[PDB]
Amino acid sequence: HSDSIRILGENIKILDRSMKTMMETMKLMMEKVDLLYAST
């Protein structure tokens, strides 16, 4: 059953896209939280 393998491979590509767009927002909230800590 190799056709559903290709369908879930496309789903793996969607998972890769979601992981990259989670890396982006974790970088933004890395930057903001790190610029918090110098001022108190």
Partner 1 sequence: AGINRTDQSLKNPLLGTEVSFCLKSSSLPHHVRALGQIKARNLASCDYYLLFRQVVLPPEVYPIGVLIRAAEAILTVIVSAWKLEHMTKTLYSSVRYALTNPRVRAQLELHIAYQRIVGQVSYSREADIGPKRLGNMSLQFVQSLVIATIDTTSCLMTYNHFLAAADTAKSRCHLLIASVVQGALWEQGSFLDHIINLIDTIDSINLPHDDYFTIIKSISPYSQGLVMGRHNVSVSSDFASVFTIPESCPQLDSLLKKLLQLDPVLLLMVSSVQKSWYFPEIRMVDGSREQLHKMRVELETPQALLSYGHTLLSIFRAEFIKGYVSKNAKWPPVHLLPGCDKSIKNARELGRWSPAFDRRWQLFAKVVILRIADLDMDPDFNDIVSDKAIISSRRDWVFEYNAAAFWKKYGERLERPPARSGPSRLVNALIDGRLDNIPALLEPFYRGAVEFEDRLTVLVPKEKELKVKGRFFSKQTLAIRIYQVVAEAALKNEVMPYLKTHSMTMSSTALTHLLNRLSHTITKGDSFVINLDYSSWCNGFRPELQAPICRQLDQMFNCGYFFRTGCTLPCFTTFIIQDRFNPPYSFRGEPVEDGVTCAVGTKTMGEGMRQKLWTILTSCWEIIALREINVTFNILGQGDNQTIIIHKSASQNNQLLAERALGALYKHARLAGHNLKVEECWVSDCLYEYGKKLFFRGVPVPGCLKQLSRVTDSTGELFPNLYSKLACLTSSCLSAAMADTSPWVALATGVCLYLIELYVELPPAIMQDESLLTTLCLVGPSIGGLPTPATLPSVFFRGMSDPLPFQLALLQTLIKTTGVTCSLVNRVVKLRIAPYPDWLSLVTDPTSLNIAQVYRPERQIRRWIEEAIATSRIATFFQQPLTEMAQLLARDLSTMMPLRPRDMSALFALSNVAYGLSIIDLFQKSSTVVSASQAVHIEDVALESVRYKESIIQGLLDTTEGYNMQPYLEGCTYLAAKQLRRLTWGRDLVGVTMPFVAEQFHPHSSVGAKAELYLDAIIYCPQETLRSHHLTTRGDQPLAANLVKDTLVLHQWYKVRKVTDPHLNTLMARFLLEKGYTSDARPSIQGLTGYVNILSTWLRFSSDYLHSFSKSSDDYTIHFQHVFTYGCLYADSVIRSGGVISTPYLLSASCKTCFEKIDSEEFVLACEPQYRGAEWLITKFDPCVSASYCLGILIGKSFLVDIRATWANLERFSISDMQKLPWSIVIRSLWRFLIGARLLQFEKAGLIRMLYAATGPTFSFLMKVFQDSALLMDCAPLDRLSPRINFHSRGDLVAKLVLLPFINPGIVEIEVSGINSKYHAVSEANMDLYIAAAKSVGVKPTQFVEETNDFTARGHHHGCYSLSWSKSRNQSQVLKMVVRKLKLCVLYIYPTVDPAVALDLCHLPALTIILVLGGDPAYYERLLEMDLCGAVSSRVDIPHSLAARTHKGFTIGPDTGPGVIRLCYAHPCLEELEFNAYLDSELVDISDMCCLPLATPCKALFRPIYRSLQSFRLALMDNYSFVMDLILIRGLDIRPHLEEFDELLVVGQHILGQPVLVEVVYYVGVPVLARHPWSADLKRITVGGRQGSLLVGLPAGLTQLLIID
Q: What share of the chain is helix, strand, coil (3-state, %, to 5)?
A: 85, 0, 15
Residue 4 Cβ vs partner 1, minimum distance, rounded to whole Å: 22
By a kind-dependent CB cut-off of 5 to 8 A, residue 14 interacts, out of partner 1, its own copies, none, with: its own copies
Q: How far is the CB of 33 from partner 1 (least distance, A)?
A: 9
18 vs 3, 11, 23, 40, CA distance in Å? 23, 10, 9, 35
The footprint of partner 1 (CB under 8 A) covers 20-21, 23-25, 27-28, 30-32, 34-40
